[PDB]
Structures are given as structure tokens and as C-alpha cells.
Design a protein around this ligand. Structure first.
Ligand SMILES: [Zn+2]
Lengths: 68, 117
């Protein structure tokens, strides 16, 4: 219940839409053009992308940071 | 060929030869393991259709058209409960890659010969 100490809420992940349609680029040709670099490790699969940050791209379940 | 699609979906279900979801379908296409892909056209999608065409027309793909998104979930069993009647709430999908390991069957050679042309 509401006590004297306020409770910090949990991380509400906002439901984003058209994310799966945002991987590749749609052109006249049927070829693929993704904007995220591929994962060369064996911990995460070949279809697993990176994150899209401002400075550095981060894995998922690999939890590996590749800087520049 | 609709009964053939019914039986191949049932055999994919019994041999776990299916990957539900369009992102799972894209991952199966990226890992080079796709055998059969099923699409829905002339349905309730404004811009999904060109994406699914441009990602499904890659290489060695046989196309089967489905007239409605929401009816597709019942052959695959997304919410397959209360079989004596109708399921309550089944979502519709766009593309599921059939990873069917079963090649020796009664109609598998027939549908493979139909897909060869
Ligand atoms: Zn990784």
C-alpha cells in the first residue's frame, strides 16, 4: 500500500509499433539492406542484430560490448 | 491443394517443423533453413504486403496465398482450446516458415512435385 516512502515504479517497456518492419529497407528491388551490424559470435545467432545507440552498438543475450 | 496445406501444417505441428512469427520467419530466412513459406494477400494490411513480398521472394520459395489473416491461426493452433466448437480468441499471422523435416509421406512427394514446377 501507499506508505511514507514512495515506491519507484517498474520499468514499463513502451509498446513500439512497426519495429519488425524497421529492420530492412524497402526498395524497388527485392534485396535486403539492414541498418544494424550483424553478430559474428556464436552466442547470438546470425539473424540477431545489435542495438541502435548514439555511439556504440550492443548485443542482446551475448552481453558483449564492441567499441570502435 | 487446401487439404494438402492442412496435412502439411499438421505434420509440421507434429514434427515441430514450424516457426511462428514474421521475425522468426526472417531469422529462418537469414539462417538459410527455409523450405515452405505461406503468405496472405488481399487482406487488411496497408504496407506489410510489399515488405513480405520483398522478403519472401528471395530464393527457392513456393508461394501459397491466404485470403484472410485471422483465419490462418486456426490451422496452426495459436489458441487451440475447446476443440468441440470454436476457440475463443486467435490472433492472425502473416508468414510462418515451414521447417518440415518429414519428406517421406503419402502426399509429401505429391506436393513436392507440385512445388517443383
Ligand atoms: Zn552478440
Amino acid at each position: 500500500k501507499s506508505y511514507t516512502t514512495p515506491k519507484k515504479n517498474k520499468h514499463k517497456r513502451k509498446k513500439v509499433k512497426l519495429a519488425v518492419l524497421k529492420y530492412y529497407k524497402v526498395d524497388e528491388n527485392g534485396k535486403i539492406s539492414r541498418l544494424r551490424r550483424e553478430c559474428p559470435s556464436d552466442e547470438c545467432g546470425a539473424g540477431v542484430f545489435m542495438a541502435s545507440h548514439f555511439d556504440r552498438h550492443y548485443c542482446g543475450k551475448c552481453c558483449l560490448t564492441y567499441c570502435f | 491443394v487446401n487439404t494438402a496445406l492442412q496435412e502439411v501444417l499438421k505434420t509440421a505441428l507434429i514434427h515441430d517443423g514450424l516457426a511462428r512469427g514474421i521475425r522468426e520467419a526472417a531469422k529462418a530466412l537469414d539462417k538459410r533453413q527455409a523450405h515452405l513459406c505461406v503468405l496472405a494477400s488481399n487482406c487488411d494490411e496497408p504496407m506489410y504486403v510489399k515488405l513480405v513480398e520483398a522478403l519472401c521472394a528471395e530464393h527457392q520459395i513456393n508461394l501459397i496465398k491466404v485470403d484472410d489473416n485471422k483465419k490462418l491461426g486456426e490451422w496452426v493452433g495459436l489458441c487451440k482450446i475447446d476443440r468441440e466448437g470454436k476457440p475463443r480468441k486467435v490472433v492472425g499471422c502473416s508468414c510462418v516458415v515451414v521447417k518440415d523435416y518429414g519428406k517421406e509421406s503419402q502426399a509429401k512427394d505429391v506436393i513436392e512435385e507440385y512445388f517443383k514446377c
